[PDB]
Write a protein that binds this ligand. Structure first.
Ligand SMILES: CN[C@@H]1CCc2c(ccc(O)c2O)[C@H]1O
Length: 281
């Protein structure tokens, strides 16, 4: 009396993610005015989220629902690699956008000289290649496989494949994916908020007759609430053998996936985007 209900929520999540990302992608391609040098990063993030919603989630829901990985044994290694790729690429693209904002605010005159049209392609390719090296190469040739007797059967068994990692791959993946981008974004947005406050205070000197806090709160709260617990539990269950159950890990991992669906609403609400959305439909 519970199988049908949860599948409805899963289908709504999948449909929402796919619809949002497809609309965001088609908006930029359709209209010339929406195109911008900075908007290519949004295109990359939208592509990553669309790939996640097209591949990772629908297959991962079947494992939860039917409780049997009825697909082939070779496929789920590819599935895990795709999941890691789709997480790392999105997080690093968000970090790139934050750094772009810092350059835009803290250096007006020199902003054009630093960033040009062609540099965006190089940055995107570097981000995606770094995402590829951390996921496909270790997963496919099996550095990550654990040595303890448990789960060796599941690696051998065709019906089973669950994530199990040594004490090194978890640390390396967590450091590459989460902590460094978090530090970079924190410092960048701290400086941006300081500059905005300085200007807001300066105006009141010559005008003798809030918004930044709200927007920064939204941007940091969404990302931190989405992704902070997952990497903490990822580190902790590997530092000590038994402190975390599997169900909690699965729940936190699935909560982490909803972020890719919220990105279009967070980052695409400018008047030009609204006009484009109205024009499309
Ligand atoms: C199947 N779930 C995986 C497991 C570990 C992991 C994920 C995402 C990014 C990483 O850097 C990871 O190490 C999760 O999506």
């Amino acid at each position: 009396v519970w199988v049908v209900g949860m599948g409805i929520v899963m289908s709504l999540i999948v449909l929402a993610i796919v619809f949002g990302n497809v609309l965001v992608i088609t908006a930029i391609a359709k209209f010339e005015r929406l195109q911008t040098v900075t908007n290519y990063f949004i295109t990359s993030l939208a592509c990553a989220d669309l790939v996640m919603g097209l591949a990772v989630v629908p297959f991962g829901a079947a494992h939860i629902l039917t409780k049997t990985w009825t697909f082939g044994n070779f496929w789920c290694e590819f599935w895990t690699s795709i999941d890691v790729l789709c997480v790392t690429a999105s997080i690093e693209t968000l970090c790139v956008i934050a750094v772009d904002r810092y350059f835009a605010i803290t250096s007006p005159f020199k902003y054009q000289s630093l960033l040009t049209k062609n540099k965006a392609r190089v940055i995107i390719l570097m981000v995606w290649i770094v995402s590829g090296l951390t996921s496909f190469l270790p997963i496919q040739m099996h550095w990550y496989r654990a040595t303890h007797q448990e789960a060796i059967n599941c690696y051998a068994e065709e019906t089973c494949c669950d994530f199990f990692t040594n004490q090194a791959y978890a640390i390396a993946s967590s450091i590459v994916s989460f902590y460094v981008p978090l530090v970079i974004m924190v410092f960048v947005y701290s400086r941006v908020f300081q500059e905005a406050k300085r200007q807001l205070q300066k105006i009141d000197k010559s005008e003798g007759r809030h918004k930044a806090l709200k927007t920064l709160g939204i941007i940091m709260g969404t990302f931190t609430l989405c992704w902070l617990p997952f990497f903490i539990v990822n580190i902790v269950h590997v530092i000590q053998d038994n402190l975390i159950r599997k169900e909690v890990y699965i729940l936190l991992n699935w909560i982490g996936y909803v972020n890719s669906g919220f990105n279009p609403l967070i980052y695409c609400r400018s008047p030009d985007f609204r006009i484009a959305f109205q024009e499309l439909l």
